[PDB]
Structure formats: C-alpha cells, structure tokens
Write an enzyme that holds these catalytic residues in place. Structure first.
Site, short mmCIF file in Angstrom:
data_model
loop_
_atom_site.label_atom_id
_atom_site.label_comp_id
_atom_site.label_asym_id
_atom_site.label_seq_id
_atom_site.Cartn_x
_atom_site.Cartn_y
_atom_site.Cartn_z
N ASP A 94 2.72 2.28 0.57
CA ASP A 94 3.17 3.35 1.45
C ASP A 94 4.70 3.27 1.61
OD1 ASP A 94 3.54 5.47 3.38
OD2 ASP A 94 1.48 5.21 4.15
N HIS A 148 1.36 6.77 0.44
CA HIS A 148 1.10 7.49 1.74
C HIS A 148 -0.10 8.46 1.62
CE1 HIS A 148 1.86 8.54 5.88
NE2 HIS A 148 2.15 9.81 5.59
#
EC number: 1.11.1.-
Lengths: 277, 277, 277
Positions: A228, A257
């Site tokens: 992420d 993400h």
C-alpha cells in the site's frame, strides 16, 4: 435508486444506492474517487455466499448529488445513518474501504451498534494520518495534504491519472492483476464525481479517529495490503491493530491500495471467513 | 424517461426509455452489451421517414436499473409488455437486434399480436443456438457459453474489448466503416451496464425459440450480415428462414454482427422498404 | 436536480441543473457540445468570491433530456425563462459561453431585464454569423453550416475529435494549457449528449441576433480569445462591440475558443472584476 439526506439551496441532496440479494445485510462504503460500483468483485462473492448487499455512492461521487457542502466525517456518518434507518437494517455488517473506513468508525462511535453485527476495515485511514507531535506515527505533515488539494484543483483529470498509478501499483500490476480497461473504468468513474467533492475530499483524510476506536463494540476485521503506497501499512493498519488488539487482522502480502480488484480473492476469502463466524 | 417494471428489495426496477417523432410507432430493442442509443443511425432515418420511434434500455443495460434478478426471456418479454401497455401502443412495429430478437419472438408468442403490425429480426438468435442432439444446427455446445460467462466474470472491461473486435470485424472495418471514436462510445456504454447483468446475459443466448416461431402471425423481416462472427448466419438466419419461409429475408453481404453502424445504409434501406409495404 | 420545461410525446422534457453557494445569483449557460460541468474552473472562483452559482444543461446535452424538438433560440430562451422563474431569481447575472451567448441576447431581448443585474458574453456568436449581402461581416456562407450538420450526422464521435482540436488549439495548448485527460473528459461529455441535438445544434449558430442587441439594458461584458478558431474574433466580438459600445470589452491574447479551461485565470479575473463593480 436514491435516498435523500438533505437540502442544498433549491435542490435536495440524494445518494444513489443499490440493494441486492437476500440474507444478512452487508453495507459496502467505497473509497475515493470511486463509487458503490467498485465493489463489484466483492458483491458477486457475497451474493453467491447468500448475503443482502447494500452499496451507496458517497455525496459528490458516482451517481449521488454533488453539493458543495457536508464534506466531513460527521455528515458522512449522518448520511450513512439515514441510509440505515431508511432501510431499517438490523444486524448489519458495515464494510469500509479507504475513505469508507472513516464512516464505519465515526458511525459506530456516535450512533452505537444497535443495528450492527460486525465491522471490517480494508485499507483503513485509522487511527490518525496527520503527523503531529502528539501523533508521531502519522503518515504525513499537513503540508502534504494541502498539496493534494492544490493538485486536484489544478486539473483533477490529469490528477486521477497519477493517483491510479499508485492506487494500483500499475508499474507492478498492469497487465497481470489489473487490465488497462479496468483502470479506464476507474478514471471514468472519478471524472464523473463532482469537481467540488474532488478537492474537498482530501481534507477529510486526516480526521482524528483516535476516540472512535474505543467505541467499537462488535467483532471487527482489519485488512491491509503490505504494498500500500496510498496508506502506508505502518502508519495505519499496524498502529490501528495496536489500538484494537481484539480485531482480527489480515496482511495482504504485496497488495497495493486497490486490493479490491488486484487481490479480489485474498479479499473475498478473508471477508467471507470473517462473516461466516 | 422511466417505466417501472418491478421491485427488487427496497428499490423499484425502472427501464430508461425515449419516445420521439409522430406516426406509426416503431419499438427498437437493442443488443448486448449496448443500449437504446445504439439505434441512433436507424432512429434518424425513421424520424426522417415519419415514424414514432420508441427505444428503451433492457434491465441491467444503459440507463435502466441494474437488479440482480429477472435475466430470462420471459421477464424480458414481460418488461416489453409493460412498456407497450404503459404507452398504449397500437399497430406497432417491433424491431429487435441480436438479443432483442429474443424479446420479439417471446412477446409475440406469449402475448399475441393485437398491438402489433409487423416484426423485424436483425442479427437474430433464432431458432436455438444450443448445439444438441435434437438441435444439430445449433451454433455451439453448452461448454462454449459457460466459457463467456467465465470470461465476463473474470474482467468484463477487458472482455468488452475482444467482444467489440468480433462484434464489428474491426480487423476489416476500423477506419473504413467504423471509427475508433464510435468503438470507444460502444465500450463506454457497455462498461456502464450492471456487472451482474453482464455475466447473466450470456446464459439467455441459448434459449430455445423453436416454439415461438409458429406463433408469428404478422409480416416479418429477417436480416443478417454474411460476415457475422458473433451469430453465424448458417446457425441462425438461414435455419430461421426455413422455419418462417414467409418472412422477407435479406442477406447483407460481408456485414459483421454490428451492421447497425457499419452498414447503417443497407440496414435503413431494407427497414424502410419493409415498413413501407 | 431537474426542472421540467415541456413535454415530448409520452415523456416530459427535464433540464438537469445545480445550485451552489449563497450570495448574488450567477447563471452559467454552457457551449456546444458540453454541459454545466464545463464551468468548473469558473464555478470554484465564483464560489470562493461569494456568489450563488446556477448551472443547467441545455436540452439535448449533458444530463438533460434528449428530445427531438425545440432546437432554436426562442425555445432555448423560454427554457432559461422557466429556470429563472422556477427559482425566483432576482438581480441575477447571466453569463453565456459560445452557444450560451445566444440565450443571454434572446432572453434579455424578449423577456426584459426585471430579474437581471448584468450580462457577460464569452466567445460570443453575436451579432450574426451568416455571411450574406446584408451581413457582410458574417463569418461563413450557409453552405459552410450545412457542412457541419452533414459531418455530425456522418459520425458525431469522430466529429467531436476534430472539433476539440480547434476548440482548444490543441496543436498549441496540449500538454501546456490543457491536459490530454481534460480533453478526454470533454469528448466523453459530448458523446453523452443526444444524437439528434448534436446535428440540430449547428443550425441555431447563424441565428440573427442583430435586433436583440439594442434591448440589452444592463451593464455587459464582452470577452473573446484572439486565437479563436471556432468564432473568429473579427466576425463576432469585434463587430458586436461596435453594436454595443457600452459593453466593457476584453480581448484574451492568443486564447482559443475553449478559453474557460486554457485561460481560466484571465477569464476569472475579468469576470470577478466585472461582477465586483
């Protein structure tokens, strides 16, 4: 379908929503700058698994109205409240992705868990992304957020492009985990959200959810992608889990993400096991 | 404009429709994965010719609602019925393209021809695309359809791309008969249909319309592209004509599936002559 | 939000509108083939400046209904009238861009200035683009307009592409003043307008506004891009200013037609100074 949450000048503020399947109600709260439609990989698995799936577009996004007011977690939580109460949802599961995890904390914290059976936080904002003296673990200084705002105002169209690159780790995932067509659909969805909402959303990202956490009462799931680039797992998920030890926690190895699409599987499998229990 | 055909959980199921011009009513029923808007080349010619043009988006497509229910020819036929009865259409012409030809057969067959003056089948599904023992002429084995479903579920975005290639014979027509912009619009329209409808539609494609055919009472037109890569003229149009000898039949030499756009002319000219009579 | 302006067959004709902010009402009337959303750079500055911003999509464009009727300045002016009266706007500022400047002249001229404080004309059609004997300054012969119509009917998708090139002077502005993403959004907006409206709009472009001009009663602003390839400053703005000497007039040095985006600044600064007074 629409649910009216307020009034802006001469017009009402309506949220676009969908209500599919039968069974225990699962409400999905999308991330920026997407819409309820972004949950399509998850919705199909829940439908197959036998759940009632509720999706809605946050104000300023997808097919909801685009006011120039109410861009803050209390309003967003109150918007959610109206949906819950409109549909008279009982024993509901609230699942938030990115921005949506701010709704889940804030609603639970303010309104309580009487209609709520469990919560799930995917790619979470929690507990506080602003890096301060009191918040050392914060992911960035205020100047950084101020940055994004400025960028969206300058050309949100062009902005969406760089955003999706990092959102999806396209340098790694394109042509593998995500098609170019899938990314095209994402840009179109974003270009379709309100101009005002686009620049106002980033200001809600460093809301302090530190006092919301202790109020989470019901079983929770915390799920984060270790790759992420948008919400560093170390400033978010990892410190959140310490704040809620009790939460069941899953790390998705090298997931970006945008793990709902790239790792839909690993996502569906954690989700369905957590709801099964 | 919308016409409500049902209810799904807390929401109603509404079909987006348009009603243009004056004169004898002509209802256009689009193909997958498009919308009423795909008939724009035909609509302009009918409007000029002096007809009342009715278009609507099948449930799950274009601007209609996107339930997770009712993806079958009886429902689709009942949806059509509601439109006809809502508008109190009398002496209407029903024109179906691809998937739309399943609506025309099924409605005529179940509801009769009291509001109906004539029918037209373009790039037809008829009579039965499933290749069986009893259906030797069928275009493909069941395994083949099961195939498409799997493909749409995997990434419908990416799927649309390969689909339009064959839909339009782009290797032949791009830059000639169809612009890249025209194809862009098509992908956007499809990306805009419901995720559920996308994967559920292909299962309605091998519906057996063999018993519907004998019920077609009114003058009919059968029109097919000999370069149809989507619905082989030999498993469809050619065996359909034998089933309805009576139908006026036109072969569009080297026209692909997507002949509404690539051969709008040859299409408009057959259509207007057949309606003129 | 929608405002109903009429009826077409079985359906009503509704205009999509937005109403943001508080303060003196400013109504923005978009150009072809765009929508109220095209004013986003201007809307944000007006909102910041403290005005109430009203935008609406002309019939056939953006999110308004797509009838096959009413494509003429009197209808468009009557559409505007309904909006004004629906919202009971008092002391309003009317700002038109390109096609929108035809609405501003025609409304003021027919309905008077009782609800109107000031007008602004950006990239104006005025006074008469048809080149005739009596109209020597006209920008083109009738044959030229007839041309565009034919082009839009042939493939409006492909048409939009060449249109935006000149609309924006992309050979000069792309990657500088306008991003490729910004242009992408524009094409998508246009592809989304009604097919009929697309081909019918160009016929309203050579409407004679010569008798409308003397009726402009309230303070006016005339603003034109000297690099306007769509509406030659010499056949428009320059002769318009002679017709209304009184108008405050601003030339935007080397700005194309699409100056709202490429020169948003120079545009906002003229606009806010003119409204300040």
């Amino acid at each position: 379908p629409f649910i009216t949450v307020g009034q802006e000048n001469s017009t009402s503020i309506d949220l676009y929503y969908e209500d599919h399947g039968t069974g225990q109600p699962v409400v999905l709260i999308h991330g920026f700058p997407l819409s309820g439609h972004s949950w399509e990989r998850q919705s199909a698995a829940l439908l197959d698994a036998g759940y009632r799936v509720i999706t809605y577009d946050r104000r300023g996004f997808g097919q909801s109205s685009q006011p120039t007011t109410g861009y803050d977690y209390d309003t967003f939580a109150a918007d959610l409240n109206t949906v819950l109460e409109t549909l008279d949802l009982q024993d509901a599961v609230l699942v938030g992705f990115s921005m949506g995890t701010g709704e889940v904390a804030r609603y639970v914290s303010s309104y309580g868990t009487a209609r709520i059976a469990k919560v799930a936080f995917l790619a979470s904002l929690e507990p506080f992304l602003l890096k301060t003296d009191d918040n050392p673990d914060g992911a960035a200084p205020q100047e950084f957020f101020d940055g994004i705002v400025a960028a969206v105002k300058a050309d949100r169209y062009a902005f969406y492009t760089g955003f999706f690159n990092d959102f999806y780790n396209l340098d790694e995932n394109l042509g593998t985990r995500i098609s170019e067509e899938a990314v095209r659909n994402s840009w179109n969805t974003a270009a379709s959200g309100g101009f005002f909402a686009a620049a106002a959303a980033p200001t809600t990202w460093y809301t302090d959810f530190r006092a919301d956490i202790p109020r989470i009462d019901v079983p929770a799931l915390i799920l984060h992608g270790t790759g992420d680039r948008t919400l560093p797992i170390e400033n978010t998920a990892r410190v959140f889990h310490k704040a809620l030890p009790s939460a069941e926690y899953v790390e998705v190895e090298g997931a970006p993400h945008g793990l709902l699409w790239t790792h839909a599987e690993e996502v569906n499998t954690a989700l369905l096991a957590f709801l099964a229990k």
